[PDB]
Amino acid sequence: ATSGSCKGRCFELQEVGPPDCRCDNLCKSYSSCCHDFDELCLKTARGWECTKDRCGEVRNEENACHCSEDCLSRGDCCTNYQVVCKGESHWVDDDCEEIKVPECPAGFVRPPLIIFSVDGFRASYMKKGSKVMPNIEKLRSCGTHAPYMRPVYPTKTFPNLYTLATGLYPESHGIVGNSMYDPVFDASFHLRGREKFNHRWWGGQPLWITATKQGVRAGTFFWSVSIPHERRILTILQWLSLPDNERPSVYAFYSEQPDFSGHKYGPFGPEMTNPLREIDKTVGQLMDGLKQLRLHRCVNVIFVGDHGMEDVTCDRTEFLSNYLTNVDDITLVPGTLGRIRAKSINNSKYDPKTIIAALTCKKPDQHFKPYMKQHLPKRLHYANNRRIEDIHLLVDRRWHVARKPLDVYKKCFFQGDHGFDNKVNSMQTVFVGYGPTFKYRTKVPPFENIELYNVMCDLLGLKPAPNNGTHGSLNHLLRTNTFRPTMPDEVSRPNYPGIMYLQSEFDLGCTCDDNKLEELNKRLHTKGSTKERHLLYGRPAVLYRTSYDILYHTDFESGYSEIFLMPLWTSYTISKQAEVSSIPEHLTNCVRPDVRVSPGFSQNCLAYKNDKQMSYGFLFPPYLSSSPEAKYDAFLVTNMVPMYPAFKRVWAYFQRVLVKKYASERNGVNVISGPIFDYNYDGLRDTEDEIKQYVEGSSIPVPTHYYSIITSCLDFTQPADKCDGPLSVSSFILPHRPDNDESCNSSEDESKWVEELMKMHTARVRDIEHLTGLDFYRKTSRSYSEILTLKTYLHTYES
Ligand SMILES: *[C@@H]1O[C@H](CO)[C@@H](O[C@@H]2O[C@H](CO)[C@@H](O[C@@H]3O[C@H](CO[C@H]4O[C@H](CO)[C@@H](O)[C@H](O[C@H]5O[C@H](CO)[C@@H](O)[C@H](O)[C@@H]5O[C@H]5O[C@H](CO)[C@@H](O)[C@H](O)[C@@H]5O)[C@@H]4O)[C@@H](O)[C@H](O[C@H]4O[C@H](CO)[C@@H](O)[C@H](O)[C@@H]4O[C@H]4O[C@H](CO)[C@@H](O)[C@H](O)[C@@H]4O)[C@@H]3O)[C@H](O)[C@H]2NC(C)=O)[C@H](O)[C@H]1NC(C)=O
Ligand SMILES: C[C@]1(O)C[C@]2(CCN2C(=O)c2cnc(N[C@@H]3Cc4ccc(Cl)cc4C3)nc2)C1
Ligand SMILES: [Ca+2]
Ligand SMILES: [Ca+2]
Ligand SMILES: [K+]
Ligand code: NA
Ligand SMILES: [Zn+2]
């Protein structure tokens, strides 16, 4: 019904309900615009710039923008009007001056926010393209910037734009790729075409909805591709000239560049200079335009990308047809990641186990690795959605995976792509904030794009919907409007058991070959006399209802679960000077009852003997005991945890070699280790009724993962246990697997593969918090916002 009119309706904010014709910034994309949309709304006459001869002209409403006297009040001047016609300077030529307070026109209730989003803008463009992007360089140097911003996985456009909008992981917002099949709708989502416009795909609450629901007006964020950039900018500036009761407070611009060119020419192709220049010119138009409206010291501006761009060519393609004989029985979502499902749900002869094995470590330099999705690095948060296929391929940077060669030459063309692991340097993107609410000439550490939703809410005075950001962790970007969170309340208080059981009350099937001056000595140790050394940041708080005990020892402190029959956490400090020792021969198979903990709340050695697949390890490593006498404590049944022999190779090397290495490199480290149970791969602590595996014959639950949090002084001239200032952390969440199939070199010595495994499984403290229902760093001398920043830190081990 496109015989309605867009007269006086151009770029209307409220989308009219068809079958009435549309005049909003998306109507082109649904082929739904009124007949006169182009004529009235996409004027082009005379181009985009005032010239000296158009100054003071009589208004001609055919023109794309105006150079008449009345244009400022009307809000439709070309962005260079005051420069060309009133001898003003371009914004970029003006010195930076601190913006201490919003300098807004009367009637503005809050500083507007404008998000300037750029597709495929790789983080290193800020330095490498700086000579050709002066407007962007001024935003960056005068505002608040990060060296880079980490996207989410997969590092594709729609997952990342919707993460920016919602503060959610793709698994939670449901946009898990640029292409998807949802088995409960039995429907497909694609970039091309129209099913993606169906609202059932899009979960959580995006910023524009959050705004609307709380009485803040929002501009429409999505722009049809054919609307020229100049027109997008002029539309924003027109909206900003609306009356107070109609004018939005939040706007987004989007550019398809430099992504579009990057795919064709590679991230640093010589052809990339012009797209970067053109983007910079658009930023300049916006800023000149704000300046003429007296809004350039009023508005907060965010310059942000969705992902970066890597060099990728046709010839760097792995073909599943080279591995699988059965290739026509699978559907592959291809490219910079792979997702595999059965071609037909009626094929009972499909077996994911046999596909995985056919794809595992088959060629010496194989450029992808298969995973069941629950085994992917937990830092990716890429499993808890039915739209994510069980079988996943993590593709090496610079490579593609495809089903058959004909897929790649029956479509070389492209030189750039993205989608890879979000740790990869080429995938990193940008963040700049400029305005009254951002800090002045401030650099901040790199951070994840899941955090920005909360900040954008802070900037608009909105209460954010529940999301995966850690609200407060980006307070250091802001001059004001910080969010002041309180530490969560401890839900369960610990018991502190003393000696309550005699040795002969235990029938655990365990065995161990085991003065009065230092008899008091060991009593004080068991009462917590060394605890200030081994528990540096306070005990972790337990944020759920459970029954647990604090157990003190010479070398380590633990919070021992009576429910899970093992520690939730074990804490210990290893100085620079500490010595590694062996497990003495007499103690090789030693497990000792803990006379503080009932036999009924203890593990037993007979279960491990019976269970031919499962062995055990220790959370506090016997190798790092302070003394031969202290070493007995490490063999308590309360320090034992279930470990597959294959995993013990990993764990033993970490404990015997790597902990001491870190303590030497970082001037002591504090370590907190423990189990994780996430059988439903939702990234959250399992309740006891969610556990799918026990040690045979017992109530001993088997962890899905083992974590460690390794903390030291950021100023490494100070020892970990005597640190005056900011901390440094690195953490991991290691999968507890019965094989080392993940590691193709695992036949080799652990010095050749364990550390690279651990790096792959690097984690944020926050990730561990979700997975354990523990809250760490409760008792430091640092600000809580600083600790939140520390908890979101990821050590990426990239160059
Ligand atoms: C990252 O941040 C997010 C947001 O904070 C965290 O996700 C939240 O996690 C909560 C715990 O898992 C979860 O709470 C559940 O909500 C159920 C109600 O859900 C609807 O309502 C909300 C609010 O409007 C809405 O956001 C939800 O949106 C999801 O689902 C739609 C599909 O309809 C999607 O479009 C959208 O993308 C989103 O999908 C994601 O979440 C769902 C899970 O809800 C996943 O399945 C998807 O894969 C995807 O990840 C919904 O529209 C509520 O019913 C649940 O309550 C049950 O569960 C517990 C016990 O298990 C119990 O206390 C209750 O009694 C109840 O049990 C009964 O029902 C069970 C389930 O059917 C049944 O098995 C039992 O037998 C019982 O009878 C639950 O409270 C919250 O929804 C999501 N929110 C979002 C946005 O994802 C996420 O955890 C964070 N991640 C990390 C790692 O920290
Ligand atoms: C066929 C196609 O039509 C699909 C293609 C590839 C991406 N795109 C778009 O249409 C496209 C158009 N507008 C926006 N705006 C973005 C959305 C968003 C989310 C959060 C934030 Cl904070 C800011 C923004 C501005 N994003 C995307 C071409
Ligand atoms: Ca993109
Ligand atoms: Ca779980
Ligand atoms: K065993
Ligand atoms: Na292996
Ligand atoms: Zn792209």
Side-chain angles (χ1 to χ4, degrees), residues 10 22 26 30 44 97 119 135 182 203 216 218 243 324 328 335 492 498 583 626 749 788:
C10 277
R22 285 175 68 186
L26 257 197
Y30 301 61
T44 61
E97 298 290 327
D119 202 324
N135 285 279
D182 184 314
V216 175
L324 300 182
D328 301 301
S492 300
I583 299 189
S626 64
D749 186 64
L788 296 177

mmCIF file with all atom_site columns, all heavy atoms in Angstrom, residues 10 22 26 30 44 97 119 135 182 203 216 218 243 324 328 335 492 498 583 626 749 788:
data_model
loop_
_atom_site.group_PDB
_atom_site.id
_atom_site.type_symbol
_atom_site.label_atom_id
_atom_site.label_alt_id
_atom_site.label_comp_id
_atom_site.label_asym_id
_atom_site.label_entity_id
_atom_site.label_seq_id
_atom_site.pdbx_PDB_ins_code
_atom_site.Cartn_x
_atom_site.Cartn_y
_atom_site.Cartn_z
_atom_site.occupancy
_atom_site.B_iso_or_equiv
_atom_site.pdbx_formal_charge
_atom_site.auth_seq_id
_atom_site.auth_comp_id
_atom_site.auth_asym_id
_atom_site.auth_atom_id
_atom_site.pdbx_PDB_model_num
ATOM 1   N N   . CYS A 1 10  ? 9.650  12.352  6.870  1.00 0.00 ? 10  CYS A N   1
ATOM 2   C CA  . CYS A 1 10  ? 10.908 11.744  6.403  1.00 0.00 ? 10  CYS A CA  1
ATOM 3   C C   . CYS A 1 10  ? 11.714 11.285  7.624  1.00 0.00 ? 10  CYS A C   1
ATOM 4   O O   . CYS A 1 10  ? 11.816 12.026  8.580  1.00 0.00 ? 10  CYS A O   1
ATOM 5   C CB  . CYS A 1 10  ? 11.712 12.724  5.561  1.00 0.00 ? 10  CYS A CB  1
ATOM 6   S SG  . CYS A 1 10  ? 11.184 12.809  3.820  1.00 0.00 ? 10  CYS A SG  1
ATOM 7   N N   . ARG A 1 22  ? 5.910  3.242   4.659  1.00 0.00 ? 22  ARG A N   1
ATOM 8   C CA  . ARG A 1 22  ? 6.889  3.591   5.695  1.00 0.00 ? 22  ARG A CA  1
ATOM 9   C C   . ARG A 1 22  ? 7.795  4.695   5.151  1.00 0.00 ? 22  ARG A C   1
ATOM 10  O O   . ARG A 1 22  ? 8.018  4.742   3.961  1.00 0.00 ? 22  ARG A O   1
ATOM 11  C CB  . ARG A 1 22  ? 7.695  2.340   6.062  1.00 0.00 ? 22  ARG A CB  1
ATOM 12  C CG  . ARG A 1 22  ? 6.947  1.330   6.925  1.00 0.00 ? 22  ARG A CG  1
ATOM 13  C CD  . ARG A 1 22  ? 7.789  0.083   7.136  1.00 0.00 ? 22  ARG A CD  1
ATOM 14  N NE  . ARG A 1 22  ? 8.962  0.344   7.972  1.00 0.00 ? 22  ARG A NE  1
ATOM 15  C CZ  . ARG A 1 22  ? 9.939  -0.529  8.229  1.00 0.00 ? 22  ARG A CZ  1
ATOM 16  N NH1 . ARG A 1 22  ? 9.850  -1.772  7.792  1.00 0.00 ? 22  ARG A NH1 1
ATOM 17  N NH2 . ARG A 1 22  ? 10.997 -0.160  8.936  1.00 0.00 ? 22  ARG A NH2 1
ATOM 18  N N   . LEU A 1 26  ? 14.831 2.355   7.775  1.00 0.00 ? 26  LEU A N   1
ATOM 19  C CA  . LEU A 1 26  ? 14.908 0.932   7.357  1.00 0.00 ? 26  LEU A CA  1
ATOM 20  C C   . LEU A 1 26  ? 13.919 0.568   6.225  1.00 0.00 ? 26  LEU A C   1
ATOM 21  O O   . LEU A 1 26  ? 13.950 -0.586  5.768  1.00 0.00 ? 26  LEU A O   1
ATOM 22  C CB  . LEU A 1 26  ? 14.609 0.037   8.567  1.00 0.00 ? 26  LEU A CB  1
ATOM 23  C CG  . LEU A 1 26  ? 15.825 -0.625  9.217  1.00 0.00 ? 26  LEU A CG  1
ATOM 24  C CD1 . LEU A 1 26  ? 15.393 -1.777  10.116 1.00 0.00 ? 26  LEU A CD1 1
ATOM 25  C CD2 . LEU A 1 26  ? 16.833 -1.128  8.180  1.00 0.00 ? 26  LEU A CD2 1
ATOM 26  N N   . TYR A 1 30  ? 13.028 -3.427  3.723  1.00 0.00 ? 30  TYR A N   1
ATOM 27  C CA  . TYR A 1 30  ? 11.804 -4.238  3.674  1.00 0.00 ? 30  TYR A CA  1
ATOM 28  C C   . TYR A 1 30  ? 11.014 -3.938  2.384  1.00 0.00 ? 30  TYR A C   1
ATOM 29  O O   . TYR A 1 30  ? 9.855  -4.339  2.261  1.00 0.00 ? 30  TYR A O   1
ATOM 30  C CB  . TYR A 1 30  ? 10.867 -3.933  4.849  1.00 0.00 ? 30  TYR A CB  1
ATOM 31  C CG  . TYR A 1 30  ? 11.386 -4.147  6.251  1.00 0.00 ? 30  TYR A CG  1
ATOM 32  C CD1 . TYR A 1 30  ? 12.481 -3.444  6.729  1.00 0.00 ? 30  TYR A CD1 1
ATOM 33  C CD2 . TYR A 1 30  ? 10.726 -4.987  7.141  1.00 0.00 ? 30  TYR A CD2 1
ATOM 34  C CE1 . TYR A 1 30  ? 12.933 -3.604  8.029  1.00 0.00 ? 30  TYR A CE1 1
ATOM 35  C CE2 . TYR A 1 30  ? 11.168 -5.159  8.445  1.00 0.00 ? 30  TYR A CE2 1
ATOM 36  C CZ  . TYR A 1 30  ? 12.278 -4.461  8.895  1.00 0.00 ? 30  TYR A CZ  1
ATOM 37  O OH  . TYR A 1 30  ? 12.739 -4.611  10.175 1.00 0.00 ? 30  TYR A OH  1
ATOM 38  N N   . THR A 1 44  ? 19.489 14.951  -3.141 1.00 0.00 ? 44  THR A N   1
ATOM 39  C CA  . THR A 1 44  ? 20.882 14.939  -3.448 1.00 0.00 ? 44  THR A CA  1
ATOM 40  C C   . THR A 1 44  ? 21.321 16.218  -4.148 1.00 0.00 ? 44  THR A C   1
ATOM 41  O O   . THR A 1 44  ? 22.522 16.462  -4.262 1.00 0.00 ? 44  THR A O   1
ATOM 42  C CB  . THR A 1 44  ? 21.232 13.733  -4.322 1.00 0.00 ? 44  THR A CB  1
ATOM 43  O OG1 . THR A 1 44  ? 20.476 13.857  -5.527 1.00 0.00 ? 44  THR A OG1 1
ATOM 44  C CG2 . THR A 1 44  ? 20.926 12.422  -3.631 1.00 0.00 ? 44  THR A CG2 1
ATOM 45  N N   . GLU A 1 97  ? 39.951 21.259  24.227 1.00 0.00 ? 97  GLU A N   1
ATOM 46  C CA  . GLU A 1 97  ? 39.730 21.940  25.486 1.00 0.00 ? 97  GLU A CA  1
ATOM 47  C C   . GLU A 1 97  ? 38.896 20.976  26.318 1.00 0.00 ? 97  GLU A C   1
ATOM 48  O O   . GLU A 1 97  ? 37.884 20.476  25.849 1.00 0.00 ? 97  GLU A O   1
ATOM 49  C CB  . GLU A 1 97  ? 39.025 23.295  25.325 1.00 0.00 ? 97  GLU A CB  1
ATOM 50  C CG  . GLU A 1 97  ? 39.787 24.335  24.504 1.00 0.00 ? 97  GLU A CG  1
ATOM 51  C CD  . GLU A 1 97  ? 41.037 24.909  25.164 1.00 0.00 ? 97  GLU A CD  1
ATOM 52  O OE1 . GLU A 1 97  ? 41.041 25.035  26.426 1.00 0.00 ? 97  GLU A OE1 1
ATOM 53  O OE2 . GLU A 1 97  ? 42.018 25.229  24.423 1.00 0.00 ? 97  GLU A OE2 1
ATOM 54  N N   . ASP A 1 119 ? 32.034 -0.830  10.885 1.00 0.00 ? 119 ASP A N   1
ATOM 55  C CA  . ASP A 1 119 ? 32.116 -2.230  10.617 1.00 0.00 ? 119 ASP A CA  1
ATOM 56  C C   . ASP A 1 119 ? 33.555 -2.592  10.204 1.00 0.00 ? 119 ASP A C   1
ATOM 57  O O   . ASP A 1 119 ? 34.207 -1.949  9.374  1.00 0.00 ? 119 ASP A O   1
ATOM 58  C CB  . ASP A 1 119 ? 31.099 -2.623  9.556  1.00 0.00 ? 119 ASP A CB  1
ATOM 59  C CG  . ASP A 1 119 ? 30.765 -4.105  9.620  1.00 0.00 ? 119 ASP A CG  1
ATOM 60  O OD1 . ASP A 1 119 ? 31.641 -4.893  9.905  1.00 0.00 ? 119 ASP A OD1 1
ATOM 61  O OD2 . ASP A 1 119 ? 29.608 -4.416  9.625  1.00 0.00 ? 119 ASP A OD2 1
ATOM 62  N N   . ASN A 1 135 ? 40.200 13.659  12.271 1.00 0.00 ? 135 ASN A N   1
ATOM 63  C CA  . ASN A 1 135 ? 39.021 13.843  13.128 1.00 0.00 ? 135 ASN A CA  1
ATOM 64  C C   . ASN A 1 135 ? 38.974 12.724  14.177 1.00 0.00 ? 135 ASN A C   1
ATOM 65  O O   . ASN A 1 135 ? 38.789 12.988  15.368 1.00 0.00 ? 135 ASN A O   1
ATOM 66  C CB  . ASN A 1 135 ? 37.712 13.884  12.336 1.00 0.00 ? 135 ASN A CB  1
ATOM 67  C CG  . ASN A 1 135 ? 37.525 15.203  11.602 1.00 0.00 ? 135 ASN A CG  1
ATOM 68  O OD1 . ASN A 1 135 ? 37.095 16.211  12.176 1.00 0.00 ? 135 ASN A OD1 1
ATOM 69  N ND2 . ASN A 1 135 ? 37.832 15.194  10.322 1.00 0.00 ? 135 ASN A ND2 1
ATOM 70  N N   . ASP A 1 182 ? 17.451 -22.527 13.740 1.00 0.00 ? 182 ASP A N   1
ATOM 71  C CA  . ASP A 1 182 ? 16.840 -22.806 15.008 1.00 0.00 ? 182 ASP A CA  1
ATOM 72  C C   . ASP A 1 182 ? 15.921 -24.024 14.861 1.00 0.00 ? 182 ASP A C   1
ATOM 73  O O   . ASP A 1 182 ? 14.896 -23.961 14.151 1.00 0.00 ? 182 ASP A O   1
ATOM 74  C CB  . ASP A 1 182 ? 16.075 -21.593 15.508 1.00 0.00 ? 182 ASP A CB  1
ATOM 75  C CG  . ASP A 1 182 ? 15.489 -21.805 16.880 1.00 0.00 ? 182 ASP A CG  1
ATOM 76  O OD1 . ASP A 1 182 ? 14.883 -22.887 17.087 1.00 0.00 ? 182 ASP A OD1 1
ATOM 77  O OD2 . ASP A 1 182 ? 15.609 -20.895 17.716 1.00 0.00 ? 182 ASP A OD2 1
ATOM 78  N N   . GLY A 1 203 ? 16.901 -11.807 21.281 1.00 0.00 ? 203 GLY A N   1
ATOM 79  C CA  . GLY A 1 203 ? 16.622 -11.872 22.720 1.00 0.00 ? 203 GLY A CA  1
ATOM 80  C C   . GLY A 1 203 ? 17.257 -10.710 23.478 1.00 0.00 ? 203 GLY A C   1
ATOM 81  O O   . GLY A 1 203 ? 17.828 -9.790  22.868 1.00 0.00 ? 203 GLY A O   1
ATOM 82  N N   . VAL A 1 216 ? 13.136 7.602   27.872 1.00 0.00 ? 216 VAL A N   1
ATOM 83  C CA  . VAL A 1 216 ? 14.175 8.259   27.086 1.00 0.00 ? 216 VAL A CA  1
ATOM 84  C C   . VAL A 1 216 ? 13.973 7.938   25.611 1.00 0.00 ? 216 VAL A C   1
ATOM 85  O O   . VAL A 1 216 ? 13.965 6.793   25.214 1.00 0.00 ? 216 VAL A O   1
ATOM 86  C CB  . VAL A 1 216 ? 15.565 7.837   27.592 1.00 0.00 ? 216 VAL A CB  1
ATOM 87  C CG1 . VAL A 1 216 ? 16.660 8.395   26.722 1.00 0.00 ? 216 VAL A CG1 1
ATOM 88  C CG2 . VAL A 1 216 ? 15.771 8.260   29.042 1.00 0.00 ? 216 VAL A CG2 1
ATOM 89  N N   . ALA A 1 218 ? 14.652 7.381   21.624 1.00 0.00 ? 218 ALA A N   1
ATOM 90  C CA  . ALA A 1 218 ? 15.758 6.858   20.891 1.00 0.00 ? 218 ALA A CA  1
ATOM 91  C C   . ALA A 1 218 ? 15.579 7.056   19.380 1.00 0.00 ? 218 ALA A C   1
ATOM 92  O O   . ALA A 1 218 ? 14.485 6.930   18.880 1.00 0.00 ? 218 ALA A O   1
ATOM 93  C CB  . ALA A 1 218 ? 15.908 5.407   21.264 1.00 0.00 ? 218 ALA A CB  1
ATOM 94  N N   . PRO A 1 243 ? 11.999 19.733  18.778 1.00 0.00 ? 243 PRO A N   1
ATOM 95  C CA  . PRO A 1 243 ? 11.587 20.266  20.066 1.00 0.00 ? 243 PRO A CA  1
ATOM 96  C C   . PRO A 1 243 ? 11.871 19.256  21.179 1.00 0.00 ? 243 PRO A C   1
ATOM 97  O O   . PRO A 1 243 ? 11.932 18.042  20.932 1.00 0.00 ? 243 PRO A O   1
ATOM 98  C CB  . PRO A 1 243 ? 10.075 20.535  19.968 1.00 0.00 ? 243 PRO A CB  1
ATOM 99  C CG  . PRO A 1 243 ? 9.679  20.204  18.541 1.00 0.00 ? 243 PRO A CG  1
ATOM 100 C CD  . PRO A 1 243 ? 10.885 19.632  17.818 1.00 0.00 ? 243 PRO A CD  1
ATOM 101 N N   . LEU A 1 324 ? 36.641 -36.691 5.883  1.00 0.00 ? 324 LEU A N   1
ATOM 102 C CA  . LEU A 1 324 ? 35.429 -37.459 6.108  1.00 0.00 ? 324 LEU A CA  1
ATOM 103 C C   . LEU A 1 324 ? 35.083 -38.211 4.811  1.00 0.00 ? 324 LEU A C   1
ATOM 104 O O   . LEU A 1 324 ? 35.094 -37.643 3.726  1.00 0.00 ? 324 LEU A O   1
ATOM 105 C CB  . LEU A 1 324 ? 34.281 -36.506 6.462  1.00 0.00 ? 324 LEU A CB  1
ATOM 106 C CG  . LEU A 1 324 ? 34.444 -35.624 7.709  1.00 0.00 ? 324 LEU A CG  1
ATOM 107 C CD1 . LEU A 1 324 ? 33.198 -34.788 7.918  1.00 0.00 ? 324 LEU A CD1 1
ATOM 108 C CD2 . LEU A 1 324 ? 34.676 -36.461 8.954  1.00 0.00 ? 324 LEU A CD2 1
ATOM 109 N N   . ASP A 1 328 ? 28.607 -35.988 2.550  1.00 0.00 ? 328 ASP A N   1
ATOM 110 C CA  . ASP A 1 328 ? 27.261 -35.545 2.086  1.00 0.00 ? 328 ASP A CA  1
ATOM 111 C C   . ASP A 1 328 ? 26.160 -35.813 3.128  1.00 0.00 ? 328 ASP A C   1
ATOM 112 O O   . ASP A 1 328 ? 25.015 -35.426 2.920  1.00 0.00 ? 328 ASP A O   1
ATOM 113 C CB  . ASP A 1 328 ? 26.922 -36.173 0.735  1.00 0.00 ? 328 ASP A CB  1
ATOM 114 C CG  . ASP A 1 328 ? 27.936 -35.800 -0.340 1.00 0.00 ? 328 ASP A CG  1
ATOM 115 O OD1 . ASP A 1 328 ? 28.104 -34.580 -0.613 1.00 0.00 ? 328 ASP A OD1 1
ATOM 116 O OD2 . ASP A 1 328 ? 28.586 -36.728 -0.863 1.00 0.00 ? 328 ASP A OD2 1
ATOM 117 N N   . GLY A 1 335 ? 33.499 -21.306 6.879  1.00 0.00 ? 335 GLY A N   1
ATOM 118 C CA  . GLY A 1 335 ? 34.246 -20.054 6.773  1.00 0.00 ? 335 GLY A CA  1
ATOM 119 C C   . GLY A 1 335 ? 35.282 -19.998 7.868  1.00 0.00 ? 335 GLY A C   1
ATOM 120 O O   . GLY A 1 335 ? 36.083 -20.928 8.023  1.00 0.00 ? 335 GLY A O   1
ATOM 121 N N   . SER A 1 492 ? 26.182 -18.132 52.660 1.00 0.00 ? 492 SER A N   1
ATOM 122 C CA  . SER A 1 492 ? 26.458 -19.160 53.612 1.00 0.00 ? 492 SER A CA  1
ATOM 123 C C   . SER A 1 492 ? 27.680 -18.785 54.430 1.00 0.00 ? 492 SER A C   1
ATOM 124 O O   . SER A 1 492 ? 28.736 -18.608 53.881 1.00 0.00 ? 492 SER A O   1
ATOM 125 C CB  . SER A 1 492 ? 26.701 -20.495 52.946 1.00 0.00 ? 492 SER A CB  1
ATOM 126 O OG  . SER A 1 492 ? 25.574 -20.882 52.202 1.00 0.00 ? 492 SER A OG  1
ATOM 127 N N   . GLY A 1 498 ? 37.059 -28.102 64.660 1.00 0.00 ? 498 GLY A N   1
ATOM 128 C CA  . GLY A 1 498 ? 38.258 -28.567 65.272 1.00 0.00 ? 498 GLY A CA  1
ATOM 129 C C   . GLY A 1 498 ? 38.363 -30.087 65.153 1.00 0.00 ? 498 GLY A C   1
ATOM 130 O O   . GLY A 1 498 ? 37.612 -30.737 64.415 1.00 0.00 ? 498 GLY A O   1
ATOM 131 N N   . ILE A 1 583 ? 57.473 -35.655 46.008 1.00 0.00 ? 583 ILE A N   1
ATOM 132 C CA  . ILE A 1 583 ? 56.710 -36.547 46.838 1.00 0.00 ? 583 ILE A CA  1
ATOM 133 C C   . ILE A 1 583 ? 57.649 -37.674 47.269 1.00 0.00 ? 583 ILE A C   1
ATOM 134 O O   . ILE A 1 583 ? 58.112 -38.446 46.429 1.00 0.00 ? 583 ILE A O   1
ATOM 135 C CB  . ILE A 1 583 ? 55.470 -37.047 46.069 1.00 0.00 ? 583 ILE A CB  1
ATOM 136 C CG1 . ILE A 1 583 ? 54.575 -35.857 45.703 1.00 0.00 ? 583 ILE A CG1 1
ATOM 137 C CG2 . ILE A 1 583 ? 54.726 -38.104 46.870 1.00 0.00 ? 583 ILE A CG2 1
ATOM 138 C CD1 . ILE A 1 583 ? 53.254 -36.270 45.152 1.00 0.00 ? 583 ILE A CD1 1
ATOM 139 N N   . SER A 1 626 ? 56.142 -26.406 52.700 1.00 0.00 ? 626 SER A N   1
ATOM 140 C CA  . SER A 1 626 ? 57.133 -25.575 53.300 1.00 0.00 ? 626 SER A CA  1
ATOM 141 C C   . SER A 1 626 ? 58.200 -26.410 54.035 1.00 0.00 ? 626 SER A C   1
ATOM 142 O O   . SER A 1 626 ? 59.256 -25.940 54.272 1.00 0.00 ? 626 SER A O   1
ATOM 143 C CB  . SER A 1 626 ? 56.516 -24.538 54.167 1.00 0.00 ? 626 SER A CB  1
ATOM 144 O OG  . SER A 1 626 ? 55.843 -25.083 55.269 1.00 0.00 ? 626 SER A OG  1
ATOM 145 N N   . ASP A 1 749 ? 56.823 -34.347 25.740 1.00 0.00 ? 749 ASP A N   1
ATOM 146 C CA  . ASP A 1 749 ? 56.988 -33.947 27.097 1.00 0.00 ? 749 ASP A CA  1
ATOM 147 C C   . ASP A 1 749 ? 56.034 -32.775 27.383 1.00 0.00 ? 749 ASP A C   1
ATOM 148 O O   . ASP A 1 749 ? 55.841 -31.912 26.539 1.00 0.00 ? 749 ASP A O   1
ATOM 149 C CB  . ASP A 1 749 ? 58.433 -33.543 27.412 1.00 0.00 ? 749 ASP A CB  1
ATOM 150 C CG  . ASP A 1 749 ? 58.621 -33.255 28.893 1.00 0.00 ? 749 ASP A CG  1
ATOM 151 O OD1 . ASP A 1 749 ? 58.455 -34.208 29.685 1.00 0.00 ? 749 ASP A OD1 1
ATOM 152 O OD2 . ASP A 1 749 ? 58.799 -32.059 29.267 1.00 0.00 ? 749 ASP A OD2 1
ATOM 153 N N   . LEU A 1 788 ? 36.636 -4.734  40.386 1.00 0.00 ? 788 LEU A N   1
ATOM 154 C CA  . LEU A 1 788 ? 35.771 -5.195  39.303 1.00 0.00 ? 788 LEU A CA  1
ATOM 155 C C   . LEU A 1 788 ? 36.544 -5.218  37.988 1.00 0.00 ? 788 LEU A C   1
ATOM 156 O O   . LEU A 1 788 ? 36.387 -6.183  37.216 1.00 0.00 ? 788 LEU A O   1
ATOM 157 C CB  . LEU A 1 788 ? 34.470 -4.397  39.224 1.00 0.00 ? 788 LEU A CB  1
ATOM 158 C CG  . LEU A 1 788 ? 33.557 -4.530  40.440 1.00 0.00 ? 788 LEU A CG  1
ATOM 159 C CD1 . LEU A 1 788 ? 32.328 -3.654  40.312 1.00 0.00 ? 788 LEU A CD1 1
ATOM 160 C CD2 . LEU A 1 788 ? 33.141 -5.968  40.710 1.00 0.00 ? 788 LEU A CD2 1
#
